[PDB]
XYZ file of C-alpha atoms in Angstrom:
742
model
C -14.187 -1.972 26.826
C -11.050 -0.090 27.880
C -11.499 0.174 31.597
C -9.432 -1.891 34.089
C -5.945 -0.763 33.077
C -6.044 3.071 33.038
C -7.070 3.779 29.433
C -8.951 6.611 27.799
C -12.794 6.837 28.268
C -13.630 6.902 24.557
C -11.974 3.532 23.987
C -14.261 2.131 26.642
C -17.446 3.248 24.705
C -19.802 1.685 27.272
C -22.112 2.817 30.094
C -21.915 6.465 28.875
C -22.509 6.560 25.193
C -23.106 3.090 23.715
C -26.095 2.171 25.857
C -27.713 5.443 24.946
C -26.692 5.160 21.229
C -28.597 1.838 20.886
C -31.915 3.582 21.272
C -31.574 6.938 19.394
C -34.399 7.684 16.941
C -33.310 7.085 13.291
C -36.299 5.570 11.452
C -34.591 3.611 8.704
C -37.846 3.442 6.615
C -37.528 7.291 6.229
C -33.766 7.802 6.704
C -31.247 6.907 3.927
C -27.714 7.781 2.828
C -27.900 10.269 0.051
C -24.978 10.787 -2.371
C -23.654 14.354 -2.248
C -21.316 15.898 -4.874
C -18.799 17.158 -2.385
C -19.131 14.966 0.667
C -20.363 12.147 -1.719
C -22.251 10.353 1.096
C -24.257 11.916 3.901
C -27.194 10.888 6.053
C -30.643 12.210 5.137
C -34.203 12.017 6.266
C -37.073 11.689 3.609
C -40.353 13.421 4.123
C -42.292 11.087 1.852
C -41.760 8.277 -0.702
C -42.632 8.675 -4.267
C -41.067 5.500 -5.867
C -37.891 5.936 -7.977
C -37.361 9.607 -6.996
C -37.391 10.073 -3.119
C -37.663 13.651 -1.672
C -34.430 13.721 0.351
C -33.446 16.214 3.090
C -29.924 15.934 4.468
C -28.353 17.219 7.656
C -26.728 20.111 5.746
C -29.864 21.102 3.931
C -31.259 20.390 0.439
C -34.908 19.607 -0.230
C -34.210 18.046 -3.743
C -35.360 14.563 -4.770
C -32.684 11.915 -5.550
C -32.980 8.640 -7.563
C -33.570 5.435 -5.535
C -30.599 3.822 -7.285
C -28.429 6.812 -6.153
C -29.411 6.715 -2.461
C -28.582 3.759 -0.379
C -29.972 2.038 2.679
C -28.997 3.444 6.138
C -27.371 1.599 9.055
C -29.260 1.204 12.305
C -28.348 3.389 15.352
C -27.581 0.310 17.445
C -24.810 -0.376 14.962
C -23.911 3.303 14.504
C -20.192 3.811 15.302
C -19.696 0.084 14.799
C -16.738 -1.578 16.395
C -16.042 -4.510 13.919
C -17.254 -3.539 10.469
C -17.624 -7.176 9.582
C -20.476 -7.409 12.204
C -22.510 -4.682 10.475
C -25.506 -5.988 8.403
C -25.851 -3.069 5.978
C -22.303 -2.738 4.743
C -22.231 -0.095 2.143
C -19.382 2.264 1.355
C -20.890 5.046 3.500
C -21.073 2.361 6.199
C -17.356 2.792 6.520
C -17.104 6.529 5.714
C -19.862 7.813 8.025
C -18.948 5.437 10.879
C -15.331 6.380 10.474
C -15.933 10.103 10.684
C -18.342 9.736 13.601
C -16.049 7.380 15.566
C -13.533 10.185 14.686
C -16.012 12.488 16.411
C -15.321 10.408 19.552
C -11.759 10.104 18.254
C -11.842 6.344 17.944
C -8.437 5.947 16.256
C -8.338 2.104 15.726
C -11.198 0.064 14.344
C -11.678 -3.489 13.399
C -12.775 -3.890 9.827
C -12.666 -7.674 9.639
C -9.019 -8.631 9.102
C -8.145 -4.989 8.581
C -7.253 -2.804 11.436
C -8.349 0.681 10.081
C -6.530 3.610 11.758
C -7.609 7.203 11.352
C -4.915 9.808 12.263
C -5.936 12.396 14.821
C -3.260 14.427 16.582
C -3.242 14.703 20.288
C -1.512 13.110 23.288
C -2.595 9.454 23.662
C -2.703 7.943 27.087
C -3.622 4.565 25.753
C -0.597 3.635 23.617
C 1.823 3.419 26.626
C 2.755 0.866 29.309
C -0.243 0.559 31.539
C -2.412 -0.297 28.667
C 0.267 -2.731 27.341
C -0.771 -4.381 30.619
C -4.320 -4.096 29.439
C -3.651 -5.941 26.167
C -0.986 -8.489 27.052
C -2.678 -11.768 26.292
C -5.910 -10.155 25.304
C -7.524 -11.442 22.178
C -9.316 -9.703 19.212
C -13.022 -10.105 20.233
C -13.058 -9.060 23.882
C -10.440 -6.360 23.826
C -10.899 -2.869 22.057
C -9.037 -2.371 18.757
C -5.234 -1.885 19.019
C -2.140 -2.970 17.079
C -0.644 -4.128 20.343
C -3.579 -6.577 20.399
C -2.858 -7.888 16.904
C 0.829 -7.582 17.691
C 0.149 -9.860 20.676
C -1.909 -12.145 18.443
C 1.113 -12.290 16.091
C 3.176 -12.861 19.161
C 0.594 -15.398 20.309
C 0.661 -17.554 17.156
C 4.349 -16.888 17.105
C 4.486 -18.599 20.477
C 1.876 -21.230 19.764
C 1.469 -21.980 16.043
C 5.214 -21.899 15.546
C 5.040 -19.929 12.295
C 6.460 -16.690 10.942
C 3.866 -14.061 11.530
C 3.818 -10.979 9.475
C 2.300 -7.537 9.635
C 1.714 -5.688 6.378
C 1.223 -1.939 7.140
C -0.489 -0.170 4.190
C -0.082 3.564 4.374
C 1.612 6.575 2.993
C 4.156 8.980 4.489
C 2.819 12.093 6.124
C -0.028 9.946 7.512
C 2.035 9.304 10.605
C 3.717 6.280 8.996
C 7.039 6.750 10.952
C 4.795 7.121 14.041
C 2.982 3.946 12.991
C 6.181 1.833 12.576
C 7.589 3.256 15.704
C 4.278 2.268 17.354
C 4.562 -1.345 15.980
C 8.131 -1.812 16.935
C 7.700 -0.171 20.423
C 5.651 -3.122 21.707
C 8.135 -6.016 21.064
C 10.797 -4.726 23.433
C 8.227 -4.565 26.237
C 7.036 -8.121 25.732
C 10.704 -9.180 25.289
C 11.490 -9.553 29.000
C 17.207 -1.362 18.614
C 14.608 1.542 18.574
C 17.213 4.317 18.169
C 18.780 2.518 15.239
C 15.447 2.277 13.423
C 14.592 5.998 14.209
C 18.138 6.896 13.236
C 18.100 4.631 10.161
C 14.924 6.111 8.764
C 15.811 9.707 7.674
C 18.553 8.656 5.176
C 16.241 5.986 3.971
C 13.549 8.583 3.496
C 16.023 10.622 1.486
C 17.259 7.764 -0.719
C 13.978 6.206 -1.420
C 10.861 8.480 -0.733
C 10.196 10.676 -3.797
C 7.353 13.048 -4.482
C 4.120 12.003 -6.297
C 1.179 14.536 -6.617
C -0.554 13.589 -3.389
C 2.386 13.016 -1.007
C 5.353 15.432 -1.013
C 7.443 12.634 0.478
C 5.774 9.652 -1.348
C 7.131 6.248 -0.772
C 8.379 4.485 -3.850
C 10.052 1.284 -2.425
C 9.046 -1.188 0.288
C 10.275 -1.698 3.859
C 10.414 -5.058 5.484
C 11.671 -4.949 9.135
C 12.047 -8.413 10.569
C 12.193 -8.175 14.362
C 13.887 -11.552 14.890
C 13.130 -13.578 18.026
C 14.638 -16.363 19.956
C 13.309 -19.927 20.560
C 10.596 -19.076 23.115
C 9.822 -15.546 22.136
C 12.746 -13.290 23.246
C 13.669 -10.403 20.975
C 16.893 -11.252 19.277
C 17.611 -8.916 16.423
C 16.191 -7.108 13.222
C 17.044 -6.933 9.564
C 15.716 -4.981 6.660
C 15.585 -6.044 2.933
C 13.927 -3.347 0.874
C 12.006 -4.265 -2.316
C 11.151 -2.454 -5.611
C 13.242 0.667 -5.553
C 11.992 2.421 -8.670
C 14.518 2.674 -11.489
C 12.462 4.831 -13.769
C 12.009 7.322 -10.808
C 15.709 7.779 -10.919
C 15.797 8.421 -14.614
C 12.369 9.656 -15.808
C 10.609 12.263 -13.764
C 7.118 13.800 -14.323
C 6.693 17.478 -13.988
C 4.324 16.957 -11.094
C 6.869 14.585 -9.547
C 10.335 14.626 -8.140
C 13.471 12.414 -7.942
C 14.798 10.851 -4.752
C 16.056 13.486 -2.420
C 19.875 12.917 -2.458
C 20.506 14.628 -5.791
C 18.469 17.632 -4.535
C 20.475 17.602 -1.346
C 23.820 17.889 -3.156
C 22.204 20.639 -5.427
C 21.458 22.419 -2.068
C 24.209 24.765 -0.854
C 24.022 23.173 2.690
C 27.424 21.547 2.303
C 29.790 23.329 -0.121
C 32.502 20.636 0.071
C 30.365 18.214 -1.882
C 29.699 20.921 -4.472
C 33.457 21.509 -5.011
C 33.896 17.724 -4.615
C 31.337 16.417 -7.144
C 31.694 19.128 -9.841
C 28.072 20.296 -9.671
C 26.830 23.507 -11.095
C 24.501 24.389 -8.065
C 21.434 24.036 -10.181
C 18.692 21.412 -10.565
C 17.330 22.941 -13.769
C 20.724 22.492 -15.397
C 20.964 18.775 -15.211
C 18.937 16.568 -17.652
C 17.841 14.067 -15.015
C 16.619 16.793 -12.679
C 14.869 18.972 -15.321
C 12.255 16.682 -16.774
C 10.484 16.692 -13.365
C 9.953 19.281 -10.637
C 12.753 21.116 -8.996
C 11.077 21.666 -5.628
C 7.674 22.105 -4.109
C 6.392 23.604 -0.848
C 6.505 22.054 2.628
C 9.973 20.512 1.940
C 13.445 21.893 2.328
C 16.534 20.491 0.666
C 18.927 21.605 3.479
C 16.665 19.795 5.916
C 17.057 16.679 3.716
C 20.822 16.989 3.859
C 20.399 17.660 7.524
C 18.739 14.234 7.706
C 21.537 12.494 5.799
C 24.552 13.952 7.319
C 23.109 13.103 10.788
C 22.541 9.497 9.701
C 25.969 9.484 7.883
C 28.039 11.029 10.701
C 27.228 8.189 13.132
C 26.121 4.713 12.064
C 27.967 1.460 11.837
C 29.953 2.362 8.639
C 33.217 4.297 8.311
C 33.734 7.910 7.199
C 35.013 7.213 3.668
C 31.751 5.713 2.589
C 29.991 8.992 3.400
C 32.149 10.448 0.615
C 31.571 7.395 -1.541
C 27.733 7.436 -1.644
C 27.810 11.037 -2.727
C 30.500 10.164 -5.231
C 28.068 7.670 -6.828
C 25.082 10.038 -6.832
C 27.068 12.861 -8.418
C 28.584 10.183 -10.576
C 25.018 9.387 -11.834
C 24.381 13.094 -12.435
C 27.025 13.566 -15.197
C 25.897 10.542 -17.241
C 22.923 11.898 -19.047
C 24.396 15.178 -20.203
C 26.590 13.477 -22.735
C 25.549 14.106 -26.394
C 26.569 10.850 -28.048
C 26.616 12.325 -31.579
C 26.181 10.034 -34.487
C 28.997 9.568 -36.813
C 28.547 10.753 -40.417
C 27.509 7.923 -42.777
C 27.522 5.499 -39.906
C 25.322 4.608 -36.826
C 27.823 4.337 -34.014
C 27.317 7.264 -31.647
C 30.600 8.840 -30.947
C 30.963 11.297 -27.979
C 32.794 14.288 -29.299
C 31.494 16.720 -26.537
C 33.564 14.798 -23.856
C 33.654 17.244 -21.023
C 30.879 16.112 -18.791
C 31.555 12.372 -18.953
C 35.114 13.316 -18.329
C 33.974 14.892 -15.058
C 31.974 11.662 -14.474
C 35.174 9.571 -14.951
C 36.916 11.775 -12.550
C 34.103 11.430 -10.017
C 33.656 7.540 -10.190
C 37.281 6.577 -10.590
C 36.819 4.953 -14.008
C 39.093 5.816 -16.947
C 38.061 8.721 -19.111
C 38.474 7.052 -22.573
C 37.562 3.468 -21.468
C 34.056 4.673 -20.346
C 33.468 6.327 -23.641
C 34.659 3.310 -25.659
C 32.663 1.035 -23.479
C 29.411 2.965 -23.791
C 30.014 3.481 -27.548
C 31.128 -0.159 -28.333
C 29.781 -2.881 -25.934
C 31.950 -6.027 -26.352
C 30.135 -9.293 -26.097
C 31.184 -12.963 -25.825
C 30.313 -15.320 -28.611
C 31.335 -19.039 -28.421
C 34.961 -18.466 -27.299
C 35.946 -15.140 -28.847
C 34.742 -11.638 -28.121
C 32.983 -9.572 -30.779
C 31.859 -5.972 -30.486
C 28.566 -4.538 -31.700
C 28.013 -1.009 -32.700
C 24.993 1.006 -31.432
C 23.021 4.019 -32.419
C 22.321 7.194 -30.397
C 19.089 5.714 -28.995
C 20.533 2.416 -27.518
C 23.519 4.363 -25.978
C 21.092 6.747 -24.318
C 19.132 3.808 -22.850
C 22.559 2.394 -21.830
C 23.595 5.466 -20.029
C 20.274 5.633 -18.205
C 20.174 1.957 -17.628
C 23.608 1.793 -15.905
C 22.609 4.690 -13.711
C 19.303 3.192 -12.505
C 21.081 -0.144 -11.989
C 24.045 1.249 -9.930
C 21.596 3.374 -7.862
C 19.365 0.456 -6.955
C 22.385 -1.705 -6.201
C 23.896 1.097 -4.112
C 20.635 1.426 -2.231
C 20.321 -2.342 -1.641
C 24.027 -2.260 -0.495
C 23.171 0.577 1.945
C 20.262 -1.565 3.236
C 22.832 -4.301 3.956
C 25.155 -1.681 5.572
C 22.463 -0.500 7.933
C 21.660 -4.197 8.491
C 25.242 -4.639 9.756
C 24.490 -2.057 12.415
C 21.016 -3.317 13.217
C 21.957 -6.994 13.576
C 23.173 -8.071 17.051
C 24.687 -11.456 17.903
C 21.605 -12.896 19.677
C 20.305 -16.129 18.073
C 17.757 -15.002 15.422
C 14.812 -17.354 14.924
C 11.218 -17.017 13.685
C 10.826 -13.316 12.804
C 7.585 -11.481 13.285
C 8.461 -9.036 10.507
C 6.533 -5.977 9.535
C 6.472 -4.672 5.943
C 5.548 -1.298 4.624
C 4.655 -0.394 0.979
C 3.358 2.382 -1.130
C -0.351 2.796 -1.700
C -2.316 1.657 -4.708
C -2.503 5.201 -6.102
C -4.880 6.373 -8.819
C -3.843 9.843 -10.426
C -4.691 11.709 -13.582
C -1.354 10.456 -15.079
C -1.221 6.718 -14.345
C 1.934 5.711 -16.227
C 4.214 2.693 -16.031
C 5.659 4.075 -12.812
C 2.108 3.981 -11.563
C 1.726 0.517 -13.034
C 4.792 -0.527 -10.941
C 2.934 0.619 -7.859
C -0.448 -0.680 -9.011
C 0.434 -4.245 -9.848
C 2.479 -4.620 -6.763
C -0.344 -3.657 -4.382
C -2.640 -5.638 -6.721
C -0.607 -8.747 -5.935
C -0.628 -7.802 -2.189
C -4.523 -7.569 -2.298
C -4.493 -11.005 -4.048
C -2.702 -12.432 -0.996
C -5.425 -10.774 1.187
C -8.234 -12.399 -0.687
C -6.901 -15.924 -0.284
C -5.920 -15.268 3.180
C -9.411 -14.135 4.163
C -10.861 -17.093 2.329
C -8.879 -19.737 4.340
C -9.891 -18.108 7.703
C -13.535 -17.733 6.721
C -13.485 -21.313 5.390
C -12.092 -22.339 8.789
C -14.966 -20.790 10.812
C -17.575 -22.076 8.270
C -16.055 -25.634 8.503
C -16.073 -25.358 12.247
C -19.717 -24.372 12.404
C -20.887 -26.797 9.899
C -22.426 -24.379 7.529
C -15.792 -19.723 -6.341
C -12.777 -18.494 -4.371
C -12.711 -14.754 -3.581
C -9.126 -14.455 -4.982
C -10.588 -15.238 -8.463
C -12.398 -11.961 -8.189
C -8.944 -10.255 -8.474
C -7.224 -12.947 -10.458
C -8.412 -11.884 -13.905
C -6.811 -8.479 -13.501
C -3.577 -10.179 -12.654
C -4.316 -12.492 -15.505
C -4.300 -9.266 -17.585
C -1.016 -8.128 -16.186
C 1.194 -11.048 -14.974
C 0.518 -13.711 -17.668
C 2.165 -13.747 -21.105
C 0.143 -11.982 -23.711
C -0.528 -9.584 -20.949
C -0.002 -5.821 -20.746
C 3.450 -5.974 -18.966
C 4.491 -8.778 -21.316
C 3.207 -6.890 -24.390
C 5.125 -3.824 -23.159
C 8.211 -5.994 -22.767
C 8.119 -7.590 -26.285
C 7.050 -4.312 -27.820
C 10.528 -2.935 -27.193
C 12.130 -5.804 -29.180
C 10.692 -4.722 -32.543
C 12.809 -2.503 -34.915
C 10.331 0.339 -35.274
C 7.659 0.022 -32.558
C 6.558 3.303 -31.049
C 4.004 3.760 -28.296
C 1.161 4.329 -30.844
C 1.987 0.856 -32.207
C 1.982 -0.440 -28.703
C -1.636 0.914 -28.055
C -2.659 -0.507 -31.332
C -1.275 -3.958 -30.321
C -3.037 -3.777 -26.894
C -6.303 -3.006 -28.704
C -5.498 -5.892 -31.060
C -5.046 -8.347 -28.319
C -7.397 -7.445 -25.460
C -10.249 -5.165 -26.577
C -13.235 -7.453 -25.888
C -11.035 -10.519 -25.414
C -10.577 -9.909 -21.679
C -13.396 -8.484 -19.493
C -11.040 -6.282 -17.374
C -9.621 -4.402 -20.317
C -11.787 -1.601 -21.702
C -11.701 1.634 -23.512
C -10.888 4.703 -21.391
C -13.630 7.193 -20.699
C -12.096 10.690 -20.078
C -14.155 12.811 -17.673
C -13.462 16.408 -16.308
C -10.691 17.168 -18.738
C -7.975 14.576 -18.085
C -5.088 15.291 -20.515
C -5.135 11.950 -22.308
C -6.215 8.431 -21.485
C -5.147 5.446 -23.616
C -6.542 2.226 -21.944
C -8.563 1.559 -18.787
C -8.342 -1.380 -16.419
C -11.120 -1.986 -13.907
C -9.102 -2.880 -10.868
C -10.508 -3.475 -7.442
C -10.582 0.350 -7.175
C -12.549 0.535 -10.399
C -12.023 1.897 -13.851
C -8.338 3.186 -13.961
C -7.085 4.719 -17.093
C -3.435 4.846 -18.227
C -1.201 6.751 -20.556
C 0.971 4.836 -23.058
C 3.217 7.667 -24.129
C 6.741 7.082 -23.104
C 6.468 3.564 -21.746
C 8.859 2.123 -24.252
C 11.649 4.555 -23.174
C 11.352 3.865 -19.497
C 10.737 0.134 -19.713
C 14.260 -0.511 -21.042
C 17.138 -1.710 -18.848
C 20.093 -2.681 -21.221
C 22.905 -3.426 -18.832
C 26.054 -2.486 -20.719
C 28.419 -5.305 -19.723
C 31.815 -3.914 -20.531
C 31.013 -0.785 -18.482
C 30.112 -2.998 -15.628
C 33.589 -4.504 -16.035
C 35.033 -1.048 -15.960
C 32.880 -0.451 -12.754
C 34.589 -3.502 -11.319
C 37.957 -2.256 -12.203
C 37.580 1.181 -10.676
C 39.124 1.858 -7.298
C 35.942 2.749 -5.245
C 33.132 1.132 -3.332
C 31.707 -0.036 -6.703
C 34.333 -2.724 -7.000
C 32.490 -4.414 -3.993
C 29.130 -3.156 -5.165
C 29.029 -4.438 -8.748
C 30.699 -7.774 -8.237
C 20.930 -20.612 -19.324
C 21.436 -16.839 -19.234
C 18.574 -14.331 -19.755
C 18.430 -10.835 -21.108
C 21.915 -9.451 -21.356
C 20.755 -6.754 -23.615
C 17.080 -6.950 -23.028
C 16.070 -7.005 -19.403
C 13.275 -4.622 -18.493
C 11.974 -2.615 -15.487
C 8.869 -4.753 -15.959
C 10.997 -8.040 -15.779
C 12.828 -7.138 -12.550
C 9.507 -5.763 -11.222
C 8.050 -9.190 -11.930
C 10.987 -11.027 -10.346
C 11.261 -8.905 -7.278
C 7.462 -8.899 -6.777
C 7.553 -12.781 -7.072
C 10.357 -12.919 -4.573
C 8.352 -10.706 -2.245
C 5.439 -13.008 -2.775
C 7.393 -16.199 -1.958
C 8.777 -14.432 1.040
C 5.174 -13.531 2.034
C 3.667 -16.891 1.287
C 6.053 -18.363 3.854
C 4.576 -16.096 6.496
C 1.217 -15.320 8.118
C -0.200 -11.796 7.753
C -1.803 -9.416 10.220
C -2.879 -6.302 8.313
C -2.662 -2.698 9.447
C -4.230 0.144 7.533
C -3.301 3.771 8.211
C -4.854 6.921 6.576
C -4.274 10.774 6.722
C -7.260 12.883 7.664
C -6.787 15.631 5.025
C -4.086 18.044 4.008
C -3.837 19.810 7.407
C -2.627 18.034 10.550
C -5.919 19.126 11.929
C -8.875 18.509 14.101
C -12.259 17.355 12.874
C -12.416 18.872 9.343
C -11.930 15.506 7.559
C -12.751 15.869 3.887
C -14.734 12.819 2.796
C -13.368 12.609 -0.819
C -9.946 11.650 0.659
C -11.343 8.961 3.059
C -13.708 7.654 0.353
C -10.674 7.501 -2.035
C -8.290 5.853 0.399
C -11.151 3.460 1.302
C -10.748 1.880 -2.154
C -7.078 2.607 -2.687
C -6.068 0.753 0.524
C -8.295 -2.207 -0.391
C -10.463 -1.722 2.657
C -13.794 -1.598 0.707
C -12.751 -4.796 -1.017
C -12.419 -6.776 2.213
C -15.586 -5.025 3.241
C -17.374 -6.359 0.204
C -15.788 -9.841 0.103
C -17.236 -10.797 3.460
C -20.600 -9.685 2.265
C -20.832 -12.438 -0.350
C -20.778 -14.966 2.537
C -22.578 -14.556 5.822
C -21.030 -11.641 7.751
C -23.808 -11.595 10.443
C -22.150 -13.908 13.013
C -24.516 -14.037 16.035
C -24.460 -16.526 18.854
C -27.654 -18.391 19.741
C -27.931 -17.010 23.294
C -26.918 -13.707 21.960
C -29.817 -13.992 19.410
C -32.059 -14.802 22.409
C -30.898 -12.124 24.843
C -31.553 -9.401 22.212
C -33.678 -10.624 19.312
C -36.136 -12.994 21.054
C -37.935 -9.698 21.706
C -38.716 -9.712 17.881
C -41.094 -12.629 18.049
C -41.150 -14.362 21.471
C -43.476 -16.962 22.849
C -46.028 -16.090 25.603
C -43.311 -16.458 28.229
C -40.143 -14.355 28.550
C -36.569 -15.569 28.062
C -35.801 -17.341 31.344
C -33.106 -19.652 30.058
C -35.265 -22.755 30.073
C -34.808 -23.873 26.340
C -31.339 -24.786 24.942
C -30.206 -21.870 22.862
C -29.931 -23.708 19.594
C -33.567 -24.868 20.049
C -34.214 -21.477 21.636
C -33.281 -19.833 18.366
C -34.958 -22.520 16.282
C -38.177 -21.624 18.110
C -37.537 -18.031 16.916
C -36.687 -18.772 13.315
C -39.634 -21.009 13.092
C -41.889 -18.079 13.508
C -40.092 -15.038 11.840
C -41.567 -15.722 8.369
C -38.128 -15.928 6.844
C -37.400 -18.471 4.162
C -34.659 -21.072 4.272
C -32.419 -19.531 1.536
C -31.946 -16.364 3.742
C -30.069 -18.023 6.638
C -27.771 -21.021 7.235
C -28.027 -23.004 10.491
C -24.876 -24.189 12.307
C -23.644 -25.643 15.676
C -22.074 -22.932 17.808
C -23.585 -19.767 16.232
C -26.132 -18.849 13.634
C -25.235 -16.622 10.641
C -27.201 -14.268 8.493
C -26.841 -12.483 5.234
C -25.961 -8.773 5.084
C -29.390 -7.244 5.474
C -31.045 -9.097 8.219
C -30.071 -7.449 11.578
C -31.951 -4.370 10.333
C -34.767 -6.700 9.582
C -34.500 -7.910 13.163
C -35.348 -4.339 14.290
C -37.986 -3.169 11.835
C -40.626 -5.489 13.320
C -38.995 -4.978 16.828
C -39.779 -1.247 16.505
C -43.329 -2.563 15.777
C -42.988 -4.390 19.115
C -41.502 -1.302 20.691
C -44.075 0.959 19.137
């Protein structure tokens, strides 16, 4: 209830709408949720029952009969527009969809979903998210207060003060869904409860240009992860902040799908916004011309390349660095551009690929600062150290193309991590930094028609994050159930990670598949079918519906059956770091001298391997903290009023992992009702001859109730402070109460 503190009347939701919503006529014995084909879930009344086929009639109008297995049970109106979706007793997937769109009808932005804080995105002015309601959530807990990320930010600040532990906040959401507004909203609150906002808001647009590419859904789709630690003092005083970004996608730099784009910086220099870079970097003004920028899409609607450069020259004109590095970063990007155009023609009667067309790598060697001939000799003949004395190997045209892609993706990710440290030099102030309450952002677990290894690099990452959620829910639910005296849920996800992380798993089979002499992608699919078809329950053959182009294997993740396309994984998996060219990178007079300054994988380290190590390092960074999840979704394509398209919310219900934490709590008892709360409301179900009165102790006052409800012992579990019930009983507490209220 959001009175007492000057907040908006919808966030109250009491004495005007809730007390009349707890009595509206919705006969659940004749009202169900029917599955639509377009909305996919919508409320319907039923005229009469027939058994398996029920004659449904929805609010939009169809008199057809629908199978009983297709329709689902409908939530009561007393739990319609439910506040905490763990308190609801009929917790279907339309129990989040329909409740989210009708809480959107009252424009309830935030919503408790158990540990999740689900956030729809309407667009208006918000009186609630400013100072006088910071006064209405300072110290206010989860249960009594209405939903708010200043409330869970003050819970993270609360256990930050009390538990003496690094608290963390893992925002899951995509760009364009107000994600910059979401992160600004998170970091706005810590300065208020303190007694570098403009550096975060200034630091973001160049970050958006170096690391936020285009997937099919999002025209500024996130690829990497953010991790903004707002460092504190000893007793909760805001000290500083640092960022350390994870999982910048290498294959995104090199290999671009035609419905996808690269990172924006190359397109900015290809834009004619600044001509001095075009004279400076020897660029032919054309994205179609370059081999890196022609495998994908040149440009799409709703984005402008000169606006992207307008972001980067604003962030580059003023920040902590000097003016020469503004030239240097562009030197490295246009230095990446001239790599791939080199032919590397095979010698006659040999295998060693000699560049004879040496005009474009000459332009590269002018752009970097490397020598012209030494770069070509180093790419052509990599010299390695054996025992004491160096020997050279040859190469063929294929391995030198993987070298000239691998050095580019490596120098781009190390340049971007370097830039994260350079922004970190600005963002860090000399206050004593202790016990961060840092907030991570990451790309969403995204399911396209072209799930590739790029998509696997998103999917297994968010898979492991969801694995941290399942254990983290299980320890808390275990804590309340051991307080009350009443298989792990992470195992429900573990098998999929068992299919992906463990050796003789799909990432491992993809890694070792490269090592063979003549192993193509068809041989790789033949090997996956050899090792896992029927051997593991997750792995299954891909059904193709509705004319997908091609699907090669399917993994039933927590979002369900997700196909994949093998073709081209062996080319994009490789990262052979050519060592002598890294030596020439050290020798060149540029930033790179500072950038690129039992062994493992000198010639065979793959994108899957560094994904595995960076994800494990993010995990051991995250297992040392304490999470507080935030979800954030876009309404539809238009920044719009209430025209929310239910396929998008039903898809991001499963892609954010919200429906998982919805269904994990259902396997225990989610119906968490207090004894006197069971007597003030549901003693009406089957009372004695005397009304309530408060003359029996509420544990025995509910034992008097359950001793006459005709409910068996296996349905409920009795405790000490509360009593719990299985999902599917607090609608049974009203079907006979409406017989009492008939």
